[PDB]
Amino acid sequence: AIQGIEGVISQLQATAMAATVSFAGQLHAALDRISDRQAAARVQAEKFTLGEPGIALNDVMADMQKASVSMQMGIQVRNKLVAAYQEVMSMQV
């Protein structure tokens, strides 16, 4: 965009001059990372099924299991956070 190029030159000026923690941001980052792991494992299995040379079955299964481990870790973290929020949010003020 014209305004997008304006923003690029503004960030360049920012770099010239150079030479906020949000919990929702960290949750978004972790969720996105889990999503990329799952998508990568899915695409690798997809490609192996189509018979693309250079893909090994053992690596496919290992990455699938790593994706499952990451998703289960996310599930457990969400469970703990939701439980803690419900215990905090039910106190009598």
């Binding site: 299995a45 997809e46 099924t49 189509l50 018979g51 079955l57 299964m61 699938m64 994706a67 499952s68 998703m71 289960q72 599930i75 469970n79």
Partner: protein, 125 residues
């Protein structure tokens, strides 16, 4: 319809593996019939063409027969050696392909089962 879309590729690949397994078993059964040509399906091409891509009668009434509405290009396997009965089934290649197809069918089952297991584990609380 996102659950159908997410599981579509592996389920369709599994169905194609079952169809090709049926064709390979038919090849093995006809191993001694003269004049038979061994046939097979190109798995990759058929899978992509299925992923990229009848007319039942209109039952407007509540009292009439539902009736019926009623597609893989079969490629011929290139023969290895000539035989006098004109049977192009080379049993070594067919057995290797049978083992490979059974193995990849089991792998597709494992992958689809893992996807379903993860989806059901997410909902369990």
């Amino acid at each position: 319809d996102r659950l159908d879309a997410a599981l579509r590729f592996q389920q369709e690949a599994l169905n194609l593996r079952a169809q090709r397994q049926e064709i390979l078993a038919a090849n093995i059964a006809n191993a001694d019939t003269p004049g038979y040509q061994a046939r097979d399906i190109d798995f990759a091409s058929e899978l992509k063409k299925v992923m990229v891509r009848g007319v039942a009668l209109t039952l407007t009434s509540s009292h009439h027969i539902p009736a019926q509405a009623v597609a893989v290009d079969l490629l011929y396997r290139v023969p290895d050696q000539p035989s006098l009965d004109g049977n192009t089934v080379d049993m070594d290649r067919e057995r290797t392909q049978f083992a490979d197809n059974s193995l990849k069918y089991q792998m597709g089952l494992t992958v689809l089962g893992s996807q379903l297991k993860g989806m059901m584990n997410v909902l369990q609380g």
